[PDB]
Amino acid sequence: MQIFVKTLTGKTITLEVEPSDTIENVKAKIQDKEGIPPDQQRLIFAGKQLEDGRTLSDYNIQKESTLHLVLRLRGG
Ligand SMILES: [Zn+2]
Ligand SMILES: [Zn+2]
Known part of the structure; x- marks a missing residue:
């Protein structure tokens, strides 16, 4: 099963x-691929910012769904 970011x-x-x-899990896969710490990542689906403890199924994220990765300004 695949999604795009x-x-x-x-x-x-x-x-x-x-x-x-979980969204936590997805951030960890993004850290593995791109080396970005999870606390720097915000993930957005259908315009809504996803929360770490909820699942892809909670959000009706399906195969071939696209999430958008927004990075926190390092140092805020
Ligand atoms: Zn998994
Ligand atoms: Zn398809």
Whole structure:
């Protein structure tokens, strides 16, 4: 099962996920691929910012769904 994650630069990465993966889990897969710490990541789906403890299934995120990755300003 695959989802796409688009960054502000237009670049897209593909993650292998499961319906019961938490948002925490997705951030960890993004850290593995891109080396960005989870606390710097905000994930958005359907215009809504996803919360760490909820699952992809909670949010009706399906195969081939696209999430948007917004980075926190390092140092705020
Ligand atoms: Zn998983
Ligand atoms: Zn398809």
